[PDB]
């Protein structure tokens, strides 16, 4: 069944799931050609795969040479999505492999349950939250990482840095999806707040800032104000 | 020209033989149906005055023996027999008849209607999808599930159609997962036509089977099948040419015959549209397009 405000806790339980994005697998730029008609042209990408429970992120980078030659890029990209996903389910052992997929979108559901037919025991599941994950995009480390690809390659992060060692996974993921909503909705601020101080450093295994406690809960009231304030913009209230 | 004689009209019930049907009272003087083309499948269907829910019915061939009907007061249903003394059997007949105690299967000459809807059907294919092999004709009604249903409860009950899944290893080819499940041609040339059906003429006279049933007895199975295997076709980019041919008139006079009020259930919405206007096979439905679109514009 769909996932929603009702069933959000299942995500923290005990039984293995994966969330799937393919919002940033297909990426182009338009521009005018020559003779003034408009072209794409297309620049690396990334399936973004996450264990919401331990914060394990499978980044698969998509090289814009899997494009080459191909028709209906962005039909192909939710099978290339599917294929990719599949492959690493499979290359799993027995006993990580995920009970359940979630995409965040459903155009991806016929496609991943079609590459998943061998694993008929695996639910993919739709989701009726509008998760952020697009956004995966605006955490500096991730985009570097894609933009400087010359090969299809897997790249493996903690998206939660170390705070497991303090906070539930329930918090982590709502700080998670807190801080990509504001990276979302305005980029330039989100990152002004996270790096306004220059004396709060990123490790070099992580993607985000040593925060103290106290320093989280700061930032994620501006951020929460952040969100507030560019809703308002929106929509005039 | 063949003859089914009834015993007698115990129960007030409408009767039905082929696309006609007929009231008939409770103690009617009525013994049976005469005039019979030979050279068809044909099904007598019934709908008691009491009980509009279940409608059953009979498929038969009447070459294949001497069929009639008698009601049961046991089970509370008029039941099919076959009579082996040809000679008892005429002598029936031929009394009736000098009766003129027994109705007239009402062809016009000019109608090749129920000829048109059961072109491919044939009586040794349906006794496959209804397994009972102790009788020569098949009973089928409203409520008997399918094969497939059943996968989603007794299986000798069950309509044992082809299972079709697009979803399914049998459909899709490992490492040709998007190509096949856009293009289904491998599903239905390869592994359907010329694996289980052999040849079209089996494809169709099933996919008609089916539709006669979901019109016949609202049998909701049966329905799901007919869509399915239009479906195949349709989203299939390489068909024979023969077989497009052939479909669009099959469903032309599948859709001629159902009756209006019944296209709500009856017609998928979503494999219709997709059939006429987003699949492969758009342009090659030129005569079932026209009628869908003159009968039911509302339903696209």
Not at chain 1, 53 to 75: C, D, E, M, N, P
Not at chain 1, 122 to 133: C, D, M, V
Not at chain 2, 174 to 196: A, C, R, W
């Given at each position: 069944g769909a996932m929603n405000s009702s069933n959000y806790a299942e995500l923290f339980n005990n039984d293995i799931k994966l969330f799937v994005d393919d919002t940033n697998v297909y990426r182009v730029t338009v521009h005018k050609t020559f003779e003034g008609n408009v072209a794409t042209?297309?620049?690396?990408?990334?399936?973004?795969?996450?264990?919401?429970?331990?914060?394990?992120?499978?980044?698969?980078?998509?090289?814009?040479?899997?494009?080459?030659?191909?028709?209906?890029?962005?039909?192909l990209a939710k099978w290339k999505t599917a294929e990719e996903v599949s492959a690493l389910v499979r290359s799993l052992p027995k006993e990580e492999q995920p009970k359940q997929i979630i995409v965040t979108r459903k155009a991806m559901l016929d496609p991943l349950e079609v590459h998943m037919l061998d694993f008929?025991?695996?639910?993919?599941?739709?989701?009726?939250?509008?998760?952020?994950?697009?956004?995966?995009?605006?955490?500096?480390?991730?985009s570097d990482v894609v933009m400087k690809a010359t090969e299809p390659q897997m790249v493996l992060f903690n998206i939660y840095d170390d705070w497991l060692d303090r906070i539930s996974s329930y918090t982590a993921f709502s700080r998670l999806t807190l801080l990509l909503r504001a990276l979302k909705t305005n980029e330039e601020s989100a990152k002004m707040i996270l790096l306004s101080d220059p004396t709060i450093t990123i490790k070099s295994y992580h993607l985000w800032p040593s925060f103290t406690d106290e320093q989280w809960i700061t930032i994620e009231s501006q951020m929460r104000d952040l969100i507030l304030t560019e809703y308002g913009r929106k929509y005039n209230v | 020209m063949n003859t089914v004689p009834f015993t007698s009209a115990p129960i007030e019930v409408?009767?039905?033989?082929?696309?006609?049907?007929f009231n008939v009272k409770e103690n009617q003087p009525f013994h049976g149906i005469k005039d019979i083309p030979i050279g068809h499948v044909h099904v007598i269907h019934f709908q008691h005055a009491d009980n509009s829910s279940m409608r059953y019915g009979y498929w038969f061939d009447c070459r294949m023996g001497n069929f009639y009907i008698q009601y049961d007061p046991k089970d509370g249903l008029y039941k099919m027999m076959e009579?082996?003394?040809?000679?008892?059997?005429?002598?029936?007949?031929?009394?009736?008849?000098?009766?003129?105690?027994?109705?007239?299967?009402?062809?016009?000459?000019?109608?090749?209607?129920?000829?048109?809807?059961?072109?491919?059907?044939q009586m040794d294919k349906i006794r496959k999808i209804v397994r009972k092999d102790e009788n020569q004709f098949s009973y089928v009604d409203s409520s008997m599930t399918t094969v497939q249903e059943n996968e989603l409860s007794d299986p000798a009950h069950s309509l044992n159609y082809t299972v079709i899944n697009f979803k399914s290893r049998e459909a899709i080819r490992?490492?040709?997962?998007?190509?096949?499940?856009?293009?289904?041609?491998?599903?239905?040339?390869?592994?359907?036509?010329?694996?289980?059906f052999k040849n079209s003429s089996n494809y169709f006279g099933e996919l008609q089977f089916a539709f006669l049933n979901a019109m016949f007895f609202g049998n909701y199975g049966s329905s799901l099948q007919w869509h399915a295997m239009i479906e195949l076709i349709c989203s299939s980019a390489t068909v024979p040419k023969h077989m497009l041919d052939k479909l669009d008139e099959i469903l032309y006079y599948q859709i001629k015959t159902l009756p209006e009020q019944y296209s709500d259930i009856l017609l998928n919405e979503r494999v219709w549209n997709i059939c006429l206007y987003s699949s492969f096979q758009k342009n090659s439905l030129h005569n079932t397009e026209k009628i869908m679109e003159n009968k039911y514009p509302e339903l696209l």
């Open positions: 042209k297309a620049i690396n990408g990334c399936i973004f795969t996450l264990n919401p429970k331990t914060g394990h992120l499978f980044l698969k980078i998509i090289h814009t040479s899997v494009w080459a030659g191909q028709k209906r890029l962005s039909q008929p025991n695996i639910a993919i599941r739709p989701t009726e939250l509008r998760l952020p994950f697009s956004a995966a995009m605006s955490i500096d480390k991730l | 409408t009767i039905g033989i082929d696309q006609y049907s009579e082996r003394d040809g000679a008892k059997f005429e002598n029936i007949v031929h009394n009736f008849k000098e009766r003129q105690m027994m109705v007239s299967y009402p062809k016009i000459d000019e109608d090749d209607t129920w000829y048109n809807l059961t072109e491919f059907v490992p490492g040709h997962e998007m190509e096949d499940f856009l293009d289904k041609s491998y599903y239905l040339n390869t592994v359907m036509l010329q694996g289980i």
